Amino acid sequence: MFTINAEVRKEQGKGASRRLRAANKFPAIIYGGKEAPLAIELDHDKVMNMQAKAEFYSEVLTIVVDGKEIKVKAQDVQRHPYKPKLQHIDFVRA
Amino acid sequence: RNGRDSEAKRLGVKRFGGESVLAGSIIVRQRGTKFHAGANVGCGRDHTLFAKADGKVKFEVKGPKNRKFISIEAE
Amino acid sequence: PADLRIDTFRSSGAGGQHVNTTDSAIRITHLPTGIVVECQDERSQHKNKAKALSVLGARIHAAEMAKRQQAE
Amino acid sequence: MLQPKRTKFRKMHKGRNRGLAQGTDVSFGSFGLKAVGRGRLTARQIEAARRAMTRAVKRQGKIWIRVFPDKPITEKPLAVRMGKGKGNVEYWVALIQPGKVLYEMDGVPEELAREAFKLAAAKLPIKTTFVTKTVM
RNA sequence: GGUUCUCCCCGAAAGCUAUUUAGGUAGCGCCUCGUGAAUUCAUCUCCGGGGGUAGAGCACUGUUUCGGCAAGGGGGUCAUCCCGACUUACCAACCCGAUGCAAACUGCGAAUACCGGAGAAUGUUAUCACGGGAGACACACGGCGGGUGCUAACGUCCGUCGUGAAGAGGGAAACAACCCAGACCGCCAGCUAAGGUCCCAAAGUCAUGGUUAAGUGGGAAACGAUGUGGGAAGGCCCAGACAGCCAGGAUGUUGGCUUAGAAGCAGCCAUCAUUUAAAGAAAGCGUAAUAGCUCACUGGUCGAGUCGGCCUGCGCGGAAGA
RNA sequence: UCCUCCUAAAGAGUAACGGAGGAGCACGAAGGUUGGCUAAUCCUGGUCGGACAUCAGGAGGUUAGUGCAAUGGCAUAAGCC
RNA sequence: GCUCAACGGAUAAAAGGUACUCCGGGGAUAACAGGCUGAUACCGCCCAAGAGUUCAUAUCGACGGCGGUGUUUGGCACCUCGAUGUCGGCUCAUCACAUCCUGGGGCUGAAGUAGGUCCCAAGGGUAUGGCUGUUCGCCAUUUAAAGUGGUACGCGAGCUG
RNA sequence: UGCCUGGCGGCCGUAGCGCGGUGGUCCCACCUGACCCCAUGCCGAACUCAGAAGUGAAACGCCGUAGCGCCGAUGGUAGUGUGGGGUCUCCCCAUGCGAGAGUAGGGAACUGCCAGGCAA
C-alpha cells in the first residue's frame, strides 16, 4: 500500500523550493547511479501520515511519476528543526 | 590591567594576480612564509617576496606539500 | 532572607545636599531574635548593606554559640 | 552545577545567537525534549531541571543531558560606574538554538515519561516540546 | 559676548596622526579658485587574483556527555615478613564507536568588499598633479556587522551606508535624526510616490470570498481553557458506541511493615489465583484500624455519531497608579 | 613608548579604564659557508637503576625543537653536530 | 654622553593648602530635581519537592521560571551652572489603590467568640506624647484604625533654620 | 614497437599506508675484503675504496586484494549582495550568488625524455 503519487519539479533553487513547502509540497530526489538524478515533488500530508510506520524506512516503495512505476527505497531524510514536518527525502533508486 | 597593543605593521599581498610589476617591486609582505619564492623572485630577510625581474605576476599551488608559489611570467 | 524586615532612611550626619536626600542608612531587624543593627558608614547603600549583613552575621552566630556555651 | 573544569580563557565575548541547532535527533534514549524557542539555559537551571526529572520516575531510567554551558557570562558589581574593565565571571550559560534536544531518557513507559518532561519544562525559560525516537 | 547693504556660482568636516594635548593648534583627507595634462576616473559585463569572516566541522589546541575495552587508584578477604597471593555494591587516563561547543581552534569555506587587465554606452573631466584662500578636528540618530553594559538606556566605543547638521515640501495627530522626495521664480492647470478615501479633512458607506464578539483591531510574557474557523489522520461504531438510568465492583487476604497499625489506603512488596454478564490484591474520602460511599471494568435500557491528540488562522484571561 | 594574538565585519587600516601575554636584551658563536644528521612521548628487554639517567630494538610521526612572549613559518629544514 | 619611560623629548634645574579666597568660562562636566532604563528595590504570577498528624495548593512554599509598577539605592549625563534654595517640623492640601478601619462575598486546619487568606470596593475616617535636627524607629497609653505611595521623596515670591 | 630495469621530471594522496602473491641472464639491493685515497665526537654500521664466490630474505619495483586514508556529484539545507515587510534580542518575501557535513558512487594512478636487458 506504499504507493506515492508525485510529480516532476521544474523550478529548482532555494526560492522555488521554499515557495513549494509553503503550499504543502516538499521536494525530494531520486538517484540510483544508473540513470539521471530525478527531481521529484511529493505531497506533504500523505507522506507525513505514512512515515509513522516502520515499513516506510525499509521496504521497497513504489513512487509513481508520469505513469512510471519506479521501485525505490528511502535512504536519507532531512526533517524540519522543530515543527513536525519534512523538508527533503533522499530516495535511493534500487 | 590590560589595554596594551602594538601598532599593526601592514602585512599581506601588495600586488595581486594579473598585476604587471617592475623589477624590485615588493609583492608580498609575508610575516611567516605562507608564500614561497617560485621563479624570478627572491625571498628577503623579512620573507618579503620581491620581484627579481619584471613582468606578470602569477600564483601557483605546485609542490609535493601544497604550498603557494609566486612566479613571474616574463613578458 | 524571607523574615528580615529591612528598612532604609536618610542617613543622619554631615555631608551636603547629597546626604540630605539619600537613603544611605540601613537597619536589619531579625524577627525570630528581635535584634537590631544600624549602620551608616559608606555613601553607597550596598557598601553600607555589606557592613550591615557582616555584623548581623557575627551577632546571631555568636549569640547561639554563647547560648550553647552557657548551657554546657 | 555542570561547570567546565579548567577552562582555556576566563572571560569571553557576548556574541550573537543565530541560525538553527545541530543535535536535532534523539540519539541516546527513546524520548527526548527538544527546545522550540530561542534563548539561554543557565547552569543552575539544568541542575534544577535534572532533579525534577529524577523524582518524576522515582528511581529508574537513564537521563542524558545533551547540552553543556561552557560559556561564561559576566556581571558587573552592584552600584559600579561603567567601564573599569570587564565584570567577574558569575554564571555559565548554554546558547540554545531552536531545535536543540535538551534531555532524553530511556527505560520508562512513554506515558510516564510524558509526565516527567512537563515538570522539567516548567522549570526552563524557553518554550519546549516532546519528541520521540525517529527511526530515520 | 557682538560683528551692520544685495544678488549669482560651488560647497565641507566633526576623521586619522602628534601635541603639559584633549573645548586649542599644525600636516594630510574632505571645500573652493586658477593653470596644465593622459578614454585619466566612476558604474556594468567578462577575465585574471589572493584572502579565512558568516556558515559548517572536531584530525589538531582546549572543552563535554554516554556506551565498550581498561592500566592504575579505594574498601576488604590474607603470607596481617613479603614476593604479590583472592575478591570487589566502586573511581578512572590512554584507545575505539556515537553527540555537542569556541573571539584568542581549522584537515573545509561562500556572498559581498578589494587590486589589476580587457571591452561598450553614458557623465557640463566626474580623476590626477602643481599654486592662491579656507573651514573643520565636541558630531546626532536610524539600518546592518560588533566590543562594552543586564543580548538595560534617546548610554558609551568603532566599522559601513543613509538622512539631520547645512533641507524646506507630503505622510507617521504633534515629532531634526524614520518613510516618500531635492524648493531658480510666477500660474484659481494636469498625472503620480509614501500614506489614505464614514465624519472633523481631500478622496470608495466600492466590488468579490472568508475570519473575529473582545471595542480585539486601539500597549506585553511564562502558563491556563469543551472561545471559534480551516486541514490532515487515528480510536470505537445501527454484530448498536459516547453520556445518562438500573446491578455487581467481591473470595482466599487484619496478605509478609520492625507479627502493636495504616484491612484495594504514607516511607512497606509483588503486579497472584478463581467466578464470569464482570471487577484493579486499586483513584479518593473517613476511621489507630474497620465500618461506610464511589469510580474503573462488565450486562439490560433508550438508540445514533462520539471521543482524544496533532498541524494552523483569529480571539479571551494572565493586566494594578498617581 | 615598543612587540604578538583577538575584538576587526575573509585586502590594508580601525576605538574604549575591552579580553590575554611580552621587551628596555642576548651572541666572537647562538654569525658566514661547506659537509653531515634527525625529533616528542610511550612499549618490550637490560648491572647497581627507582614513575623518571645512559644501552639495544619497536611503535610513533613532528604531539619536538626553535637564546626569551605570542602568531605565522620551518625537513630543500630556519631544528641538531 | 639622556628610565629626556609624561618615551615627537616645554627648562640644565620645581612639591602642597585654600572653608579668607578671586576672575574668566561650562550644563562640553558633577551634587539636588526631571527624562530614558529597571541591574537592585517592591508587588503579582507559573511549576511543585516538601512542611502542614493523614493530605502538595486552609495556610506557607525549597531548587527554578516569566512579568508588572517607576516608590529605594544606582546606571547613563538628555534639560538648567548670565542660579532650578535642599533635610525635618509647621500650615494647608490633592490624587491613585497594591485596603489599616468601616461595607459586601468565597474558602478554612471556620463550633461559638476572635482570627488566617483571597476577591469587589477609594464615600468618609485614619492618634496624643517621651527621646533625637530628625525622617525612620523604639517605648508609654489609646483608638474602629493609627494604611502604603504620587504630587521638584507636595508645599521658603507662606513660616521656622 | 612489445614487455621489464635504471636515471631525471611533469603532476601531487583517485597517485599514500595495510594484507597476500611474485622477479634476479641484465639491471638493482644485500653481500666479500679493506693496509692505502678517505671516514667514525667509539665502531668501514653510515660515508669511501678494491671487488663480487652467494642470495632475492630484507630493501626496491611489479601484480592482486577495498580493510583504512583519499576523491566525490545530483537534490536539499546553512549563510548572504541588493530591494521590500513583520510578532523587527530575530526571521520572512521578491531576486541573484550558493556552500560545509552527509548519500549514491569513483578509486588501489597517469604520463614525458633518455640509457641497457630481453625479443621482434
Side-chain angles (χ1 to χ4, degrees):
Chain A
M1 56 81 74
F2 293 100
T3 299
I4 290 88
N5 290 317
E7 292 300 317
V8 179
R9 300 186 65 256
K10 61 177 180 296
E11 294 296 324
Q12 65 185 2
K14 188 169 71 173
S17 299
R18 201 167 292 173
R19 184 180 300 114
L20 291 178
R21 208 166 294 104
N24 294 322
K25 286 182 171 298
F26 70 102
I29 197 71
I30 291 179
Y31 49 86
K34 297 304 177 180
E35 76 282 2
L38 195 57
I40 303 303
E41 167 270 310
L42 283 67
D43 184 71
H44 190 276
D45 292 326
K46 294 184 178 178
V47 182
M48 181 57 207
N49 288 118
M50 190 175 288
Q51 73 166 358
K53 297 179 292 296
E55 296 88 1
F56 185 70
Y57 296 104
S58 67
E59 300 303 319
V60 176
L61 305 174
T62 308
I63 179 169
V64 174
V65 47
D66 303 328
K68 295 180 62 63
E69 295 297 315
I70 301 175
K71 299 175 72 70
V72 302
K73 283 195 300 182
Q75 181 64 50
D76 188 69
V77 50
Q78 291 186 347
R79 299 178 180 283
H80 180 279
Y82 53 99
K83 298 174 182 175
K85 292 183 181 179
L86 274 76
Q87 287 181 352
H88 192 279
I89 298 177
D90 290 326
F91 286 111
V92 158
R93 175 168 176 175
Chain B
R1 182 183 180 75
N2 301 112
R4 294 181 298 279
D5 183 74
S6 174
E7 182 177 359
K9 301 179 65 65
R10 302 89 165 87
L11 281 60
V13 189
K14 288 303 178 59
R15 294 303 168 78
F16 300 98
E19 176 80 30
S20 66
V21 304
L22 276 78
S25 180
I26 282 176
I27 299 174
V28 175
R29 282 293 296 282
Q30 183 52 60
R31 188 53 62 198
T33 316
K34 286 194 299 180
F35 290 104
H36 288 285
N40 290 114
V41 292
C43 189
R45 51 176 295 170
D46 288 338
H47 296 175
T48 303
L49 283 76
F50 66 107
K52 206 161 68 69
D54 50 354
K56 181 69 66 178
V57 173
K58 186 177 183 59
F59 290 94
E60 294 290 329
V61 291
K62 70 185 68 175
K65 282 181 264 65
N66 292 313
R67 48 190 58 189
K68 280 77 72 174
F69 279 107
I70 295 177
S71 65
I72 296 175
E73 294 298 321
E75 290 302 319
Chain C
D3 58 349
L4 208 61
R5 193 273 303 282
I6 305 169
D7 291 328
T8 181
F9 53 96
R10 269 76 73 188
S11 62
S12 305
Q17 304 184 355
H18 187 197
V19 79
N20 292 134
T21 56
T22 303
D23 289 327
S24 63
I26 303 300
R27 274 188 315 160
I28 293 172
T29 301
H30 191 271
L31 294 177
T33 65
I35 191 162
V36 171
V37 279
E38 299 191 344
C39 189
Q40 49 180 344
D41 300 325
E42 297 297 315
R43 292 175 181 280
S44 173
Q45 173 177 345
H46 298 84
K47 292 178 182 178
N48 217 154
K49 191 172 179 179
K51 290 182 183 179
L53 286 172
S54 177
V55 177
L56 198 265
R59 294 282 191 281
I60 55 178
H61 183 70
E64 282 299 319
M65 288 308 287
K67 191 169 179 295
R68 294 182 181 179
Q69 196 53 251
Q70 196 171 352
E72 188 178 0
Chain D
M1 59 182 73
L2 285 76
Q3 178 180 7
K5 274 80 67 176
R6 188 179 174 284
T7 59
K8 184 172 169 57
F9 290 110
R10 303 182 52 192
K11 305 176 281 291
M12 66 181 287
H13 302 166
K14 179 176 295 297
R16 289 298 182 269
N17 186 7
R18 305 182 64 194
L20 299 176
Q22 279 308 305
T24 64
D25 296 323
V26 167
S27 58
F28 290 117
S30 176
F31 305 105
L33 179 141
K34 185 185 299 181
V36 171
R38 181 188 304 279
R40 58 176 65 188
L41 298 186
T42 74
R44 63 185 65 190
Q45 284 170 4
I46 281 88
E47 188 61 30
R50 192 175 59 78
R51 290 181 181 177
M53 294 175 60
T54 299
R55 288 196 293 271
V57 294
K58 297 288 285 189
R59 271 98 65 91
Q60 58 189 7
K62 190 58 177 301
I63 302 168
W64 281 282
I65 297 95
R66 287 295 293 282
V67 294
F68 192 75
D70 85 11
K71 198 184 77 173
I73 278 303
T74 61
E75 184 176 0
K76 192 69 174 181
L78 292 177
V80 180
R81 296 182 183 288
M82 284 291 105
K84 297 295 183 180
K86 194 168 176 57
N88 296 314
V89 173
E90 287 295 326
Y91 61 100
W92 306 79
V93 303
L95 283 85
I96 304 303
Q97 293 85 17
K100 185 68 170 303
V101 173
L102 296 178
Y103 306 101
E104 51 191 3
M105 299 185 294
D106 187 74
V108 292
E110 180 175 358
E111 182 61 35
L112 188 55
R114 187 63 61 83
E115 187 176 356
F117 293 106
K118 280 173 79 293
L119 307 183
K123 298 171 185 291
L124 286 181
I126 55 183
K127 179 186 295 181
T128 66
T129 184
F130 179 78
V131 65
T132 61
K133 182 177 181 58
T134 61
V135 181
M136 185 176 73

